[PDB]
Symmetry: C2
Subunit: 200 residues, 2 copies
């Protein structure tokens, strides 16, 4: 069976993703996890720490999948790189819907909690950011488009698309699987649009 801490973290992902941070209570996470309530306090102190730890836990496993992807695909054109990784993220969300539902809740938590998580994730997200930045120096940019506007626009596209499908398909993995081909084709054309508009 799961360790206690892992049982609580799984229950937390499920409850938080189902109800959002403010509505969820630790008592129902403990009940979901079938664990003594004071065990949540033992391991996590309070609800805010539980959420943050659950959040770091899910992102940590994704960061690792990203790190291998980056190693193997490091030489690709950056738009092909992005498209391929978006496909993998879409694949993962469909097979891990509870985790995907949980991740999108980061917009509900107070200012302070979301900023803490963003401060503590900055170092890991900057790994993808710094790779895009270096890859853009190889790009034959339009005479009116700076590497800065390119980086800004590409990251917004990337992060914004993820936000859109996670929110749109929230709690509906079968719908995501059903639209997967179409989303993928749409993402291909949009990245080609951006490449063509940004380059000579």
């Amino acid at each position: 069976m799961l360790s206690k801490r892992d049982a609580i973290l799984k229950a937390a992902v499920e409850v938080f993703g189902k109800k959002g941070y403010d509505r969820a209570t630790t008592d129902e996470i403990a009940e979901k996890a079938g664990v003594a309530k004071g065990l949540i306090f033992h391991y996590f102190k309070n609800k805010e720490e539980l959420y943050y730890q659950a959040y770091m836990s899910v992102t940590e496993k994704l960061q690792k999948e990203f790190e291998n992807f980056l190693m193997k695909n490091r030489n690709r054109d950056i738009f092909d790189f992005m498209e391929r990784w978006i496909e993998k993220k879409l694949e993962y969300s469909a097979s891990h819907p509870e985790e995907a539902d949980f991740l999108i809740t980061l917009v509900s938590v107070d200012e302070g909690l979301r900023k803490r998580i963003l401060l503590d994730l900055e170092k890991s997200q900057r790994v993808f950011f710094d790779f895009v930045r270096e890859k853009l120096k190889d790009l034959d940019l339009a005479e009116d488009v700076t590497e800065e506007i390119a980086l800004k626009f590409l990251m917004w596209f990337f992060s914004g698309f993820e936000e859109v499908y996670l929110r749109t398909y929230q709690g509906k993995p079968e719908l995501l699987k059903r639209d997967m081909n179409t989303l993928v084709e749409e993402v291909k054309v949009m990245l080609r649009i951006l490449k063509k508009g940004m380059t000579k």
Copy 2:
């Protein structure tokens, strides 16, 4: 002085925008508005109705500003149209920060409340949507870009940019005013990027 219902609505915009929907209580809105609590019940029934009415109230005044803008700018190129309207939205957010802070809270409310508001706003948002759709028939699109992918991408850009700056500048109007010129220049280049990538 304000009518009672208007006093409650103003207090609601301020409290909801400061604390988010779940955290806010009607008692503190009434206290903020300096009105009897049962007056909130008289006019609004419960917290969910108050939020929805406040939301319809702020969007109604924006929809009207949009309708005049559309009338006067109807003949413009759609990318110039979008850029000009984005400038006006940025101007408005900076001079109505409490309203801007309130509008971005729509991501925290339960699924049911946000969908109700989205169902009831569909008819008014579709006014801008249907104009873009007709304007795209005049566009000399790339041989690989459908009017459907164009419409999808332009609306996402438009709605996504608004979401980004509202969230980024939340509670910081002086920062928005300070970055306004740069944001505007960035938006110009990004729309030119999209136009160039979408067209022949």
